[PDB]
């Protein structure tokens, strides 16, 4: 169950990660807007979302509001992408209830580790 | 099969260059700074060089003079890899004698497309 949701707009970053998942045993989906992404969650489930901060049609904190508020998406894991810079600024210590984050641009090695991290991570409390 | 010099101090940047031209058969080459570049000046040579336009050591101007003062390297094709922002306004217009340009962030797609029509030409 390597299925991942990647919601990015900027299409070089999505292609990249795309790319990057392809080639370490992972299927990943694009999304390259806000509608795109919502029309993802049914079957086969994302098992982890990439979540960019903003996309045409929605936010990121709007997605993840819609993710809580049914059961069958509640507990997908979602991994927030975070531009570096004014944004990567705007978003530290935002709580969000998104389970991880990672910052552009990445290495393919460090995008791999940290949602293998986040997928073999006990259900907290 | 073919050899891409990839010289990027961008470590993500750099990594991920290296990744897709991997996986597409290239044979990439890493230079994180100006002096180990100009340690990958020799046989084998590169087919091709993707280029920053600043490096801890020295700068894409003094990489490309350098490639250009020697009869083995002149003729090898340099694409830049440009930032977007600041950079990318300094160098427009720069006739730096470099065979393209590519702007970060790219796709895999294109970053292979880009340096293959560069070769063919
Ligand atoms: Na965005
Ligand atoms: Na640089």
Not at 60 to 80: A, C, N, W, Y
């Amino acid at each position: 169950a390597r299925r991942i949701l990647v919601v990015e707009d900027e299409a070089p970053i999505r292609e990249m990660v795309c790319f990057v998942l392809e080639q370490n045993g992972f299927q990943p989906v694009e999304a390259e807007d806000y509608d795109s992404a919502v029309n993802q969650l049914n079957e086969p489930w994302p098992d982890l979302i990439l979540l960019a901060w903003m996309l045409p049609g929605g936010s990121g904190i709007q997605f993840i509001k819609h993710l809580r508020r049914e059961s069958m998406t509640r507990d997908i894991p979602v991994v927030m992408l975070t531009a570096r810079g004014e944004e990567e600024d705007r978003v530290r210590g935002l709580e969000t209830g998104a389970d991880d984050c990672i910052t552009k641009p990445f290495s393919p090695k460090e995008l791999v580790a940290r949602i293998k991290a986040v997928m073999r991570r006990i259900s907290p409390m």
